[PDB]
Amino acid sequence: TKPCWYWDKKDLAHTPSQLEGLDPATEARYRREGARFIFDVGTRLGLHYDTLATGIIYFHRFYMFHSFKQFPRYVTGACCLFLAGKVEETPKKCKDIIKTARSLLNDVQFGQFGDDPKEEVMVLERILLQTIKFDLQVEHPYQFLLKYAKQLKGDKNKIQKLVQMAWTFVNDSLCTTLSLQWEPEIIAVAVMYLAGRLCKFEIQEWTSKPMYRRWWEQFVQDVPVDVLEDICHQILDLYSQGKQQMPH
Amino acid sequence: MSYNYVVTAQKPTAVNGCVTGHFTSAEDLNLLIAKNTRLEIYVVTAEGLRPVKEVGMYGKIAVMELFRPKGESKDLLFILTAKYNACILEYKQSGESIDIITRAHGNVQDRIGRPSETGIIGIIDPECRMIGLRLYDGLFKVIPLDRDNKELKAFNIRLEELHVIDVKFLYGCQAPTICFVYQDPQGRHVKTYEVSLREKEFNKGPWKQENVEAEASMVIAVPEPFGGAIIIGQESITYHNGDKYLAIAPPIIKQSTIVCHNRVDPNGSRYLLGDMEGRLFMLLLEKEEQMDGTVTLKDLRVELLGETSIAECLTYLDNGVVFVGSRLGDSQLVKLNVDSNEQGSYVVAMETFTNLGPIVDMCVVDLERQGQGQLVTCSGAFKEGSLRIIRNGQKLHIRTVPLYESPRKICYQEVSQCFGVLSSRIEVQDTSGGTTALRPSASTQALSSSVSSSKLFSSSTAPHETSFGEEVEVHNLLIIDQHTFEVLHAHQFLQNEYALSLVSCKLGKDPNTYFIVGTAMVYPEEAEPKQGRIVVFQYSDGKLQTVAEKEVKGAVYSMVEFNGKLLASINSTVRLYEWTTEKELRTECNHYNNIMALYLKTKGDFILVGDLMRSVLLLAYKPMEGNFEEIARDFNPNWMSAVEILDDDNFLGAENAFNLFVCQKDSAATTDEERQHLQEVGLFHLGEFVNVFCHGSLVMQNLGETSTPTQGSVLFGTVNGMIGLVTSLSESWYNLLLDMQNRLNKVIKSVGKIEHSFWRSFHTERKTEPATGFIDGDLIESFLDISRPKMQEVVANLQYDDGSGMKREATADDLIKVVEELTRIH
């Protein structure tokens, strides 16, 4: 009925970009660059967190079917955000996305947009819709993170720190292929698991079953701890490369 | 941007209603006859009927009743139009000046309501205290007949019984009572209610409800000293009056449906009844004078007088003379005699008034190579079946050809000096197993005859078991001589086969001129027909030979000769057949995007398809590809009745709500979508039901270019026998005539003070739009019949522009010569 939008870590070694001579580190760099571009363009435009995530998901899904060598990452990123606006009912004129794109990009970076920046983006919409197979409805970890945290009952301050920190990890997991590997319900639980381990919080105590150690099962059944640890490890590798450690 | 003119050539001849009273003066006995939009007034004389005045209304006459209120020296008339325009009129003559004063008027339409199945019913209280109108189901409107009620203000009383069959006001009651027959799940019943004007509501009826016959069709209020009511059914006539109850079921009445009644004697002793077979009976109420003094009703009796035309309404005048107002056939004045003639009949036909009746189909032909033309119509139904040859003369000459059976389609074959006419006769199921005809008709009385010997439908293994007395239609193709109108041949079709379409033409490279018929296998079980035939016949040496037959999976509603090929419509499909060198039809292409393709008209490679519900479509045969192509469609749901192509870009269509409309090709190449949209540009509430559109005219057209600048001519036949004409106008001609209409309305005093703009405004139960791109030719032609001072009032300060001529303020002689020019088109 609906297409499958999930892959193994092993499969990512065979994306079109990879097999076109691009190495793994470079495709990962282009995915962070592209995601942070969509995020910063749409943040400047004053768009909802769901509209930004929807655009990033379309972007990540697109470079599963196409090569970064053949499709300039920033032109595709502008296109994703343009379509995501219409999908999430927060539309923005293409001229404004272009205007913001030139403001955030340098001269070399904006060269990708060619002579007619609007046309370059509009034209690509046909391929983007075909690539995403017209499966426009997208769910994000945010909604699930909020639904599960709402069901926790305990110290409002400690629960708030967990939610606030887990929200940040969702914003970082956007730069990664985690969206292409696990369902938002799994990612939402994984960021709660990560925020909890850093805060030294026993999340089971705030649930309807304070005696049930694997608390997450009452939100997502059939999710083994090792899957949560893999998602946690991948999120922490973003902080390990540079600074930002794991604050508060 | 469409500009058309529409004028009446023959007024509607069918009688819809007729009342008698003392309308012109207290002494004169009058007879008023309403023929759709027209109203005729006559004075009854010993010789017959003397005409005294005829008027037109801006509405279809639905109710018409005379009544004498308290204080009036003579009767006043009440009329209600189909568009709900109520009005009380008065006849007033001053020497020679005959006028119809509008004493009271107003529109009685309710904001919310469901129109009733049995139509509008209007009845007046014997004491003349109120006009009872049944417009909507579950509501009974009451206009109090008061001195101060000039606007005709009314209130609705809630009615418990939703489905009402008929209602009348009873005589001899202390309070104004209504008596009605209604229907519910438990069957049909008769009930009564008292109507309190003071309290504005119904009260308990004087007598109990009673369960009546399943087909109780009419209520008859009986005058004093009997009171109560008679209920006419299919098999029984019953009298109800509280405790009293009589019921007679004479076998004579069961064989045909009684359709109308009338009171002969004022006391209510004798009553005339008329049924679908024309048969006219007398229902006599046998009295029994009690010792009390009162006279109780002992028994009811029926007596067959004779045969008349299939009456819509009977109305006896005086003496043996009765006026038989017929809608299907010719109306009559018949003399009832106390002694039966040698045939056993007490009726003697005195005078016959022509009624072009339901004009189901027609064709324009030049029988004498004159260049004027003649219209041969398929008019009437049942024993009233006939052909009418109308020719211009200043009166129309009409020659009738009685067929004594229903005609369906006509067409002319010049090669054979004769017409082909499809016709249906009713035979009933007899004890022999087969069927038998009630009377002999055109098809049975043919010089030479044949029966289709096709084995296309074979055994059919179809359970069609039939009981006795059931009616069945028998379809035939009649071959009638173009000069004597003698039935040369009659070919009867297969059992349960209905002939729907007929064409005369040569096809392909075949030099013979064939008569092709399209049929449908009509079984009661089938919702829509699943089988049919396209039969090709050739008339030669006084006999029809079957040339070829092509089976189809549906009804063949319409056929047309299309560039040597045969274009036919089978249910939802529009097919184009080719005539092979093997004398056989072989399909070329199809178009299946239709609900039900009923009407076809072609102009070159274009085809105009009239659908059942999706209005009209413009198809085109692409010769290069050998298939059809949808040029543009009218996206307005319109239930059609007939279609016609005026020209390459303009297409006239007639609707079931008595409306006319014209669509034009958008002719704007900015997009492919707008090009495919047919825009309704002309709209006009005709007021008639158009069955057929036909290109031609009866006017003598000379060798050169003569007559009015109105180019084109399309005659049309209607259900009420009215014949009209449509023609196109130039832009300057239309704007001039449109301004004339506005000026004309401001001076012409209408009957019932009905707005002309309202009347011609396009109307269906859902939408009501103002008429556009259409000129009421009857309003324009009436300019000549007004006084000189009113003519000069109309022309005062009238400017025209962009007609290759200056401002020139039109004057009386300018418009009198232009209107006289427009009358010469019919």
């Binding site: 391929i127 075909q130 | 904001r111 579950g138 919702a527 995007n593 996206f635 239930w639 079931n656 139960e765």
Partner: protein, 333 residues
């Protein structure tokens, strides 16, 4: 695979003809050349358009792939015009939204006055329309465009709700600023006429009330050319909007601007007295002025009129044809 959309070409459908002019493109009747099924195709032209693919087609795609119900139209797949030259820039094609083909729209049936609905036909129709609508409202979707031409009905007697081009999501938690100009004027509720922009799903219930009364009269109950004239019609029947019956009416913008001629009393039960008590009560509740006092889609399904209506007994609404009216005369008078 079946999940992969937009890849298959439109040439795999044999077009039968144009059936209507849609919101963003034409609608064609067509047959699948492989399976022989009949389908309806909505053309979505993006080449002549600015801001590419239209938001109206995006809404209809996003919402209909999420909604699956017997009384809501089915979008089967999406197909494209023949690709050419191998350059997507030069490609100025158009997509087509493939749908289930329906035999009619309520508009055409009522307009051509070719149908008659008994109490049992209205019961069957309304139970489907309300069941379909209740599914949408439970998924937090406003239709916002309910009208006769948007209620498809096939010969089976099945009803399907369609044209989700104006449909939007609704967030009950807190309030979202929407568009004031929604639904055609005849089926528009009073709150939108008086300027409400943060409205509820009760707007669709008003449209369905307008439809209910209309099935009993064969005519739209409120027909006016302008907002003020429309509010006058609604006021003549439902009563003038006033704080006595609608306390929050004073909060709307055009409350003082759009005042009816008089302070009318409610006459809905009086005027529609010819309707069976069960349906008259349903109509009375659906055409309630204050949207906070107007019934929900779920409540209409648990009403004396519809609750007991059997799901299995579809009762197809008889459309008389062929032998009907082609030659009426005294036999059919």
């Amino acid at each position: 695979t079946e999940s992969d959309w937009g890849k298959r070409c439109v040439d795999k459908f044999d077009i039968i003809g144009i059936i209507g002019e849609g919101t963003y493109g034409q609608v064609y009747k067509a047959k699948d050349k492989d399976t022989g099924e009949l389908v309806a195709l909505k053309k979505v032209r993006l080449d002549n358009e600015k801001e590419g693919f239209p938001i109206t087609a995006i809404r209809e795609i996003k919402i209909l792939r999420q909604l699956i119900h017997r009384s809501v139209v089915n979008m089967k797949e999406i197909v494209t015009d023949k690709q050419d030259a191998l350059d997507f820039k030069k490609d100025k094609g158009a997509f087509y939204l493939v749908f289930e083909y329906m035999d009619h729209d309520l508009m055409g049936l009522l307009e051509s006055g070719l149908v008659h609905f008994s109490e049992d036909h209205i019961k069957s129709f309304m139970k489907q329309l309300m069941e379909g609508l209740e599914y949408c409202h439970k998924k937090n979707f406003l239709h916002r465009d309910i009208k006769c031409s948007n209620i498809l009905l096939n010969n089976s007697g099945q009803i399907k709700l369609a044209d989700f081009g104006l449909a939007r999501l609704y967030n009950s938690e807190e309030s979202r600023p929407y568009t004031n100009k929604v639904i055609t004027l005849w089926y528009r509720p009073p709150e939108l006429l008086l300027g409400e922009e943060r409205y509820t799903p009760a707007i669709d219930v008003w449209s369905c009330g307008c439809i209910l009364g209309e099935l009993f009269t064969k005519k739209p109950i409120f027909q006016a050319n302008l907002e003020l004239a429309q509010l006058e019609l609604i006021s003549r029947l439902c009563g003038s909007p006033c704080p006595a019956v609608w306390p929050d009416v004073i909060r709307l913008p055009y409350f003082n601007t759009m005042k009816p001629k008089k302070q009318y009393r409610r006459r809905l039960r009086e005027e529609f007295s010819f309707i069976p008590s069960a349906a008259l009560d349903l109509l009375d509740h659906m055409l309630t002025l204050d949207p906070s006092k107007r019934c929900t889609a779920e409540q209409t399904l648990q009403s004396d009129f519809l609750k007991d209506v059997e799901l299995s007994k579809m009762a197809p609404p008889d459309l008389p044809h062929w032998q009907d009216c082609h030659e009426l005369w005294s036999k059919k008078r």
